Ligand binder design. Structure first.
Ligand SMILES: C[C@@H](C(=O)O)N(C)C(=O)OCc1ccccc1
Ligand SMILES: [Cl-]
Lengths: 305, 301
């Protein structure tokens, strides 16, 4: 037993991380097959970032304007192109450590592991959720740009996130690996703020299932409810609406604990309207919403990669 | 900016994890150079759980009673010895993925990453502290024995923990990589319980310093305290005593924020008296005690 915020093992991604330098900007690249992926803003100066013309800035650049370093080894860039807000640098060598991977775009509410890197050196790994407002509550310092987020499904790495910027609230914004931003953000130095955030309902329920599986049971009760009834309380408390898709996804945890989702919803309705009355769940005084149902099944059944 | 429970990148440890089978028992081992380290309880049977005689069970094994698998490959055991509660199997192949490593025994309050493994394959990585009562609050299922805890400071992996068992309260006990248990525990299924657990006071102060560096000031107050009056209050909340060593260690966070260690102690006394009043600090509605002064400086600008 026990229940922790748990990241995927990061080894398959550590072997893909490189340093990319253009002018005075150094940040991180993802080296897969014979291509290095990084944020297009690497090619920008300070003056550029205010109103950047990336098309124009990039055609001006040549292959030797990009220094790609994998440890103490220089990669030769033999091509450079842009896809949305990601730069692709073709190199003369395929990464012999390239894992089985694909590029995936995640939905708000889904979780992933971030490998925080500096100058192409992996530094730390943590579990994040894509917030309903398309920010992540990350931990990033200067030089963390191009750090990536991923899941693992068997032996396949699904890359879902690349770090581009910090917002003035301390939350973080970035793209999928095809360069499409998550959320209404742009890669220019301008005034941007996250739409007010909301709580990921189906994840709070998954965490209450993890608590019950670990013998934290005090919050259970004789009551049940309906989606409509619950979603009226949910709307009121800035919780996401709970769909029938969400109730199906919790099916496993519902059956494996003999608590039906709407029975557990009855427990959540009461926690929002009353509080925890001085108590904790799994050593939190908050309702935790960064564990998906899959996360809870994986951690409590001992799934391996 | 941002503040997160952050583990070390697990790749250097992943390439060292193998599966060790003895009899019908399978758990994880750690393959470094030409040695595989694992909990010695792998050599117990169902009647040996309470009072195993390890020296007696071990002398009855040959090298070929040990099945060691590194992915698809079977390794060949050419030797076996016991050091305290750790079994060491000499194998004919050095691990080509062996990183720079050392073994270090940590003190209560220290943090490390755990690579939770099953059948020699990694499931996940998370951050832990050694509790003042020499347990860890891990996430471990049956088959996770031999999973290790580690720090990575500058390309070198310091192994500090190997998982041996779960106590009845659901907390975890294990050894250093020399096989010496943390705390008053033995590798026997005789009834054992941890001492009452306390909060790691120095770690709470480090985390309050991190909150200030990230632009939180709502919990600060105009008061200071003596070290003695602080300990008299804190202990009434099951807080660890704060020592002058603990004060010294917070020096750099004190310097970087311009808040004195004993001013921050006054803040903590007040937070204990009032709670958070529905507010949060760095995302938590509890006071977090699993970040060290060293972790806070490494993660903070
Ligand atoms: C560290 C450990 C030890 O004696 O090796 N220790 C101090 C300890 O009290 O472990 C519990 C125990 C020891 C002997 C008999 C029953 C239970
Ligand atoms: Cl230590």
């Amino acid at each position: 037993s026990g229940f922790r915020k748990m990241a995927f093992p990061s080894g398959k991604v550590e072997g893909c991380m490189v340093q990319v330098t253009c002018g005075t900007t150094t940040l991180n690249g993802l080296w897969l097959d014979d291509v290095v992926y990084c944020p297009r803003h690497v090619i920008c100066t300070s003056e550029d970032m205010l109103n950047p013309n990336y098309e124009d800035l990039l055609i001006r650049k040549s292959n030797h304007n990009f220094l790609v370093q994998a440890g103490n080894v220089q990669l030769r860039v033999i091509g450079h192109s842009m896809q949305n807000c990601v730069l692709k640098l073709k190199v003369d060598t395929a990464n012999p450590k390239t894992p089985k991977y694909k590029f995936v775009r995640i939905q708000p509410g889904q979780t992933f592991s971030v490998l925080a890197c500096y100058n192409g050196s992996p530094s730390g790994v943590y579990q994040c959720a894509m917030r309903p407002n398309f920010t992540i509550k990350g931990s990033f310092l200067n030089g963390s740009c191009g750090s990536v987020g991923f899941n693992i499904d068997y032996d396949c790495v699904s890359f879902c996130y690349m770090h581009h910027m910090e917002l003035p609230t301390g939350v973080h914004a970035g793209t999928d690996l095809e360069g499409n931003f998550y959320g209404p953000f742009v890669d220019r130095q301008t005034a941007q703020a996250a739409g007010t955030d909301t709580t990921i309902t189906v994840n709070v329920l998954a965490w209450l299932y993890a608590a019950v599986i670990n013998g934290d049971r005090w919050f259970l009760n004789r009551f049940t409810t309906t989606l409509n009834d619950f979603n009226l309380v949910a709307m009121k408390y800035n919780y996401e609406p709970l769909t029938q898709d969400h109730v199906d996804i919790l099916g496993p945890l519902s059956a494996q604990t003999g608590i039906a989702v709407l029975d557990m919803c009855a427990s959540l309705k009461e926690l929002l309207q009353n509080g925890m009355n001085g108590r904790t769940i799994l050593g939190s005084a908050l309702l935790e919403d960064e564990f998906t149902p899959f996360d809870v099944v994986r951690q409590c059944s001992g799934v391996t990669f």
